[PDB]
Ligand binder design. Structure first.
Ligand SMILES: Nc1nc2c(ncn2[C@@H]2O[C@H](COP(=O)(O)OP(=O)(O)NP(=O)(O)O)[C@@H](O)[C@H]2O)c(=O)[nH]1
Ligand SMILES: *[C@H](CC(=O)OC(C)C)n1cnc(-c2cc(OC)cc(C(F)(F)F)c2)n1
Ligand SMILES: [Mg+2]
Lengths: 208, 123, 1008
């Protein structure tokens, strides 16, 4: 039960940061431009069984475009992402949506305004209207705040499975094993542990 | 869901990190409710913690008595400790975990609850 | 494995090996897929790969292989088409055309390879963009003749013409020069009568539903630009509004076509065209009523079930009704035979308006706002929609969303951001309009809805919340007398709920509702002092409650009420022993005992608001003195215990106490502004030495523990001290009225404290806040302290530049504050830059250009502004050695740097101000405002000529694929237009199009 998911948008918008946040739970602060495409499997546990997305995280920078619309073929859903702090990223949404629906003429598409955590927001809410005439779903999201980070996938899973009451559900919690530490390297797992102690945790000014 | 036969000894909101030894960085693993679950059949106590909206498991392992909660150089509201058997993502891997709370009081209460659970497992 | 073999072009390609790589990419997995992807990219980007397109399209067993092959022809056509010899061109043309006919005559390929035909059609259109019609004048007449031969060719040419229409009208702006788009726009316009004919026959004749849909999809793109005659002087409106609305296969695209029609401004004097605009609305609303749903249908339930294409059609319907009525409802408001049509359409929108789907709700709400505003000014209209509006009154009251002020939420009643905020503001605006349209019906609904919360008839958290927020939102619509009765009959009624609901969860809920309502009705509180006092007192009680949400909201409400009712706390009211401000100040410690520090500060900020109303200086300064009693006492004690034993600050609890003291001062100074000076003088001198003290502790810790020390709670606590102190001073100076005291009392003791300490600290220990503070100082006082500005520059300029001039990411907060400071200095105290040594002034110019190339818009925009104001500052000096030395040394630096960011495709967000900067620079020369020769070329040569030569040589080496004539014409048109910004911009934008292709036409720069 696996679907192909193409993720387009201008560079810097947060495409791969958003996907990484769902794969591992981490937030990546460094911008390392994607090169062509990165494919990742991503699984969610619903009340109608598991659902797997093959997320084709596409590159935004033109100089790293790779196959470009070659990545869109046989897609079954897609996210277009822009940056609510960068007006031009929303200006180009009609261009990404152009190349995406010429290859994929009938798929559920989510439009995402990332970076709503930044307070000096440039792309005002009342001005976001591209999704109306084109039957796209829209969400404000922030991969840093996790605000609405669940919703693009929940909506898409509701449209591909065909169930409007599909919901996310808690995984089964297997009973953890009983393992004693290894005394052969126990004398060395203070090396790996002191490093960790002396490396300050990121974002000590957050609420958690 | 597989926690029918378990009692909740303690619950606290927390952010959990894992240490990437290669890249020298702390990386977030999840944010949600951290629970101490005592199995009613075996009387072993585990940490189980799930992410907020996806409810995915980001930590599930025994609160082994071998473990020790150390402080982090940059926080008065977190603890660092080694973990050799955690099955959150599948096969039992080993990790160095850091967990941060909303206040120094939450951290201290956690440490109290953490080793209270350790003696229970020592039985 | 050896998938790399296909990279070697000395061979001739193994098509079977290519197709495996492709399959391993699309269908594969893991690392094999990751290696196939990299191999295919390298294959695609090879400049010679297009010569293998032919053979991949002949021999390949894989469609994806043919797709990528066409991706390689597309890039050749768009970018290097005119470089090829003519023979290769007509070759590729015939090949592409031949395949399309080949795939559209094989009936099984036509069905199964839809993507690969579409990609071919697009590729054909790229050729048309380059060759049509000047070289291919018979493309369209052939295309219309070719459409009779087959049904598959007919609908595929509908695809080619849709795509051609998009590429010419919908997307030409950014991709073509103005002259070329003008060209292809006219070329299509001249040949559209033929196209429409074929398009009308196919529709009227009727045929395959696929050919019909494709023709309609094509029509949708024509309606964006074709003249009105083709829509209204043919029978096509009756086709779209009747025939095609019935079949659900053509219904989606039909409604869209009709939405585009509806969005034209008709010559609104033609009773025959008005006739037809009404007719196609009448027909479409009839077809919906008989073939899809009646007006009474529960569209909420339909949308929730999401069968087939329901949610899409209902969205599409919503877009159609709102678009139409917003433009043409006046056509239906007069003729009584059309009254039912008007109301049925609006009753559909009432039903659409109760679907649970935020983004759709916002669509219909936008219309409702359009309608109610109209009914609120236009005479004699509102009585028509009396029925509609009472329904709407209900829809909005029952779907109010949580406002900013309410801080308690259900998960579990616990303590949504700007997307909800904006929505609430939009609902309030409609509801306010609706209340003004009938204020009795609104109250009647709200009261009875509240009367049924008492009964418990439909008591719930949702129900009491939405009702409480609606009530709060309409504040300011009723008469004061009706308000009084209404307000009184919403609070008491709300108290007989808390009184009878129990168990914390239910009471934190009603507490948030009662607080929101009272905070929203200040005019009522002002005239009923005895009630106002009761509220503030109860608010003070909520500040002692265990539920953290209530606590936090009680403070936000207190400060909210106070900002509107300041004056009723400053005077001694009747019934009272004293001004209430004095009673609040007295119990300050008990009232705020259970609040967190940052709520305590909000409380003090509120008192500051009140105090600032007292006009009598002597009375106010005493009030301020009284309010600050607690933190002043704690400050005196902590300064005497820092006096002796400077070790006392090692205590972390002492660090926190100091911090909270300074923040309390920061909080009160925020609201009191210039009225805060006496309190600032009380602590200024000790504070600045405390600042010196803490500075040394941080330096000591970094030395004793290393840079890691900056991450520790100890040092972070001490840096908070330094930051809050700077924030206090920055806060006061920004609002000060008595600037002479600032200069003579505050500034120099400040500069001595913070500057050297900033310059001599390790980078990771410097506080970007220092820069922000200095920016404020220069902005408000810089014109009176020329030597102070010099000292600030020497203190922060060079060292913070070295921080930020290695990459674009390190020290982001310094980066921004830095150029903020260089901007204000360059604007207010430019003399300080003239005093720089020549070495430092070159770093200044380097620093400005460094700002250009940032992608961060905080830095990028400031940089461009600095460069613009710098030029202006130099030119105001006139003909003087410095100005001449500036131009000779830096004129071309700026011109070439501005050109770099304009053309490098990495700084698009700044195009406007880069264009503005380059235009001024060029206008300096063409106005002879540069009196020295700009060169080091024969003698007597004008700067206008040398600039032309310099730029022609510059661009030629940076863009060697441009011809000498292209660069010659571009600069000619660019310099003629250096006083006309929009034309100037258009010429640069034409240029950016031409540097992405070979063969650009130089005449395109005569478009103006
Ligand atoms: N403040 C904030 N920053 C974010 C957020 N999401 C991503 N970013 C930041 O945006 C920057 C770009 O990261 P990235 O995910 O690679 O964007 P991208 O669109 O995938 N780049 P490309 O398309 O060129 O491969 C990162 O620095 C990241 O920290 C967010 O939600 N909030
Ligand atoms: C409800 C009591 C409650 O919710 O307790 C929480 C946990 C603190 N309740 C009863 N009466 C009020 C009330 C009375 C007022 O008289 C002026 C004013 C208010 C206020 F909200 F406007 F401050 C509330 N609340
Ligand atoms: Mg990326």
């Amino acid at each position: 039960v696996q679907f192909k998911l193409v993720l387009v948008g201008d560079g810097g918008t947060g495409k791969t940061t958003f996907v990484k946040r769902h794969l591992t739970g981490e937030f990546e602060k460094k911008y390392v431009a994607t090169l062509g495409v990165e494919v990742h499997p991503l699984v969610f546990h619903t009340n109608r069984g598991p659902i797997k997305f093959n997320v084709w995280d596409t590159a935004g920078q033109e100089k790293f475009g790779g196959l470009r619309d070659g990545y869109y073929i046989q897609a079954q859903c897609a996210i277009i992402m822009f940056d609510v702090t960068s007006r031009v990223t929303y200006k180009n949404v009609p261009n990404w949506h152009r190349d995406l629906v010429r290859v994929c003429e009938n798929i559920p598409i989510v439009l995402c305004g990332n970076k709503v955590d930044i307070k000096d927001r440039k792309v005002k809410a009342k001005s976001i209207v591209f999704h109306r005439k084109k039957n796209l779903q829209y969400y404000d999201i922030s991969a840093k705040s996790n605000y609405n980070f669940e919703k693009p996938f929940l909506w898409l899973a509701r449209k591909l499975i065909g169930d409007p009451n599909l919901e996310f559900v808690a995984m089964p919690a297997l009973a953890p094993p009983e393992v004693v530490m290894d005394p052969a390297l126990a004398a060395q797992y203070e090396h790996d542990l002191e490093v960790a102690q002396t490396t300050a945790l990121p974002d000590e000014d957050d609420d958690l | 869901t597989m926690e029918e036969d378990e009692e909740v000894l303690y619950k606290v909101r927390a952010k959990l990190f894992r240490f990437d030894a290669d890249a020298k960085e702390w990386k977030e693993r999840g944010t949600g409710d951290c629970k101490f679950l005592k199995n009613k059949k075996t009387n072993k106590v585990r940490i189980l913690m799930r992410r907020d909206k996806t409810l995915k498991i980001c930590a599930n392992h025994i609160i082994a008595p071998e473990y020790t909660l150390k402080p982090n150089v940059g926080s008065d509201r977190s603890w660092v400790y080694a973990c050799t058997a955690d099955i959150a993502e599948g096969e039992a891997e080993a990790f160095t975990f850091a967990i941060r709370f909303g206040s120094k009081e939450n951290a201290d209460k956690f440490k109290e609850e953490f080793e209270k659970a350790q003696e229970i497992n020592k039985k | 494995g050896s998938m790399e073999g296909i990279l070697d072009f000395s061979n001739d390609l193994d098509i079977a090996l290519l197709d495996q790589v492709v399959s391993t990419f699309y269908q594969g997995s893991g690392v094999q897929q990751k290696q196939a992807q990299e191999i295919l990219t390298k294959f695609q980007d090879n400049p010679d790969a297009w010569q293998k397109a032919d053979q991949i399209l002949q021999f390949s067993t894989n469609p994806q292989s043919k797709f990528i092959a066409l991706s390689i022809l597309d890039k050749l056509i768009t970018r290097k088409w005119k470089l090829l010899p003519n023979d290769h061109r007509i070759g590729i043309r015939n090949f592409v055309v031949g395949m399309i006919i080949s795939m559209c005559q094989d009936d099984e390929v036509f069905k199964t390879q839809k993507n690969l035909i579409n990609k071919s059609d697009l590729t054909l259109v790229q050729i048309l963009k380059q060759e049509w019609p000047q070289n291919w004048p018979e493309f369209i007449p052939e295309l219309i003749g070719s459409s009779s031969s087959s049904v598959n060719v007919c609908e595929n040419n509908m695809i080619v013409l849709k795509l051609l229409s998009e590429e010419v009208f919908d997307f030409s702006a950014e991709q073509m020069t103005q002259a070329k788009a003008l060209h292809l726009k006219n070329s299509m316009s001249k040949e559209f009568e033929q196209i429409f004919k074929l398009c009308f026959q196919v529709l009227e004749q009727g045929s395959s539903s696929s050919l019909i849909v494709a023709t309609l999809e094509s029509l949708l793109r024509y309606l964006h630009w074709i003249p009105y005659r083709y829509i209204y002087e043919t029978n096509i409106l009756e086709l779209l509004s009747t025939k095609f609305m019935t079949s659900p296969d053509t219904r989606a695209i039909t409604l869209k076509c009709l939405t585009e029609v509806s969005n034209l401004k008709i010559p609104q004097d033609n009773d025959l065209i008005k006739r037809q605009t009404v007719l196609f609305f009448q027909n479409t609303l009839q077809q919906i009523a008989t073939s899809v749903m009646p007006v009474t249908a529960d569209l909420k339930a339909t949308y929730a079930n999401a069968n087939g294409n329901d949610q899409s059609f209902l969205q599409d319907l919503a877009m159609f009704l709102t678009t139409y009525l917003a433009r043409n409802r006046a056509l239906l408001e007069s003729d009584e035979s059309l009254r039912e049509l008007l109301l049925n359409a609006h009753q559909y929108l009432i039903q659409l308006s109760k679907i649970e789907e935020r983004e759709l709700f916002k669509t219909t709400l936008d219309y409702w706002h359009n309608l109610v505003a109209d009914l609120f000014y236009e005479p004699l209209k509102k009585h028509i929609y009396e029925e509609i509006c009472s329904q709407l009154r209900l829809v909005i009251i029952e779907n109010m969303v949580r406002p900013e002020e309410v801080l308690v939420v259900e998960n579990e009643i616990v303590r949504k951001e700007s997307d909800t905020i904006q929505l609430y503001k939009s609902e309030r605006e409609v509801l306010v309009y609706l209340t003004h349209l009938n204020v009795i019906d609104t109250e009647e609904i709200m009261i009875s809805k509240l009367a049924r919360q008492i009964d418990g008839s439909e008591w719930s958290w949702h129900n009491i919340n939405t009702l409480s927020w609606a009530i709060g939102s309409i504040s300011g619509t009723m008469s004061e007398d009706t308000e009084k009765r209404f307000v009184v009959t919403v609070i008491k009624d709300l108290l007989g709920l808390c009184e009878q609901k129990r168990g914390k969860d239910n009471k934190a809920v009603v507490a948030s509702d009662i607080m929101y309502v009272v905070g929203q009705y200040p005019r009522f509180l002002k005239a009923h002092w005895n009630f106002l006092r009761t509220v503030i007192l109860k608010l003070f009680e909520f500040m002692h409650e265990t539920h953290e949400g209530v606590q936090d909201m009680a403070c936000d409400t207190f400060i909210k009420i106070v900002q509107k009712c300041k004056y009723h706390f400053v005077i001694q009211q009747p019934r009272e022993s004293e001004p209430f401000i004095q009673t609040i100040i007295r119990d300050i410690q008990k009232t705020t005992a259970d609040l967190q520090p940052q709520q305590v500060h909000t409380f003090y900020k509120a008192c500051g608001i009140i105090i600032s109303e007292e006009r009598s200086v002597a009375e106010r300064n005493r009030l301020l003195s009284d309010l600050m009693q607690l933190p002043n006492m704690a400050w005196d004690t902590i300064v005497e215990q820092s006096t002796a034993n400077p070790t006392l600050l090692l205590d972390s609890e002492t660090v926190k106490i100091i911090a909270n003291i300074i923040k309390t001062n920061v909080a009160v100074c925020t609201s009191m502004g210039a009225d805060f000076y006496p309190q600032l003088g009380h602590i200024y001198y000790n504070m600045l030495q405390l600042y010196r003290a803490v500075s040394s502790m941080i330096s000591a810790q970094v030395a004793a523990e290393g840079l890691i020390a900056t991450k520790t709670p100890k040092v972070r606590g001490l840096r908070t001290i330094k930051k809050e102190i700077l924030k206090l001073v920055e806060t006061y100076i920004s609002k000060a009225r008595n600037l002479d005291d600032v200069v003579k009392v505050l500034v120099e003791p400040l500069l001595n404290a913070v500057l050297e300490d900033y310059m001599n600290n390790v980078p990771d220990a410097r506080d970007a806040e220092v820069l922000n503070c200095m920016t404020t100082v220069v902005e408000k006082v810089g014109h009176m302290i020329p030597q102070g500005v010099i000292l600030i520059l020497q203190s922060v300029f060079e060292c913070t530049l070295d921080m930020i001039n290695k990459d674009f990411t390190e020290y982001p907060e310094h980066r921004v504050e830095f150029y903020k400071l260089l901007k204000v200095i360059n604007e207010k105290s430019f003399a300080a830059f003239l005093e720089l040594p020549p070495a430092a002034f070159k770093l200044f110019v380097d620093a400005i250009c460094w700002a250009f190339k940032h992608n961060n818009r905080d830095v990028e925009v400031n940089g461009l502004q600095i460069a613009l104001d710098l030029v202006k500052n130099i030119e105001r000096m006139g003909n003087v050695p410095f100005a001449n030395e500036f131009h000779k040394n830096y004129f071309f630096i700026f011109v070439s740097e501005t050109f770099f960011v304009l053309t490098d495709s990495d700084h698009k967000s700044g195009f406007s101000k880069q264009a503005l900067l380059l235009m001024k620079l060029i206008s300096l020369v063409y106005d002879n405002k540069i009196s020295v020769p700009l060169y080091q070329v024969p003698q007597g040569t004008s700067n206008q000529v040398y600039l032309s030569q310099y730029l022609a040589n510059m661009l030629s080496n940076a863009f060697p694929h441009l011809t000498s004539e292209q660069i010659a014409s571009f600069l000619s048109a660019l310099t003629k237009q250096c006083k006309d910004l929009v034309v100037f911009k258009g010429t640069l934008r034409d240029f950016l199009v031409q540097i992405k292709e070979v063969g650009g036409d130089p005449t395109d720069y005569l478009f103006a």
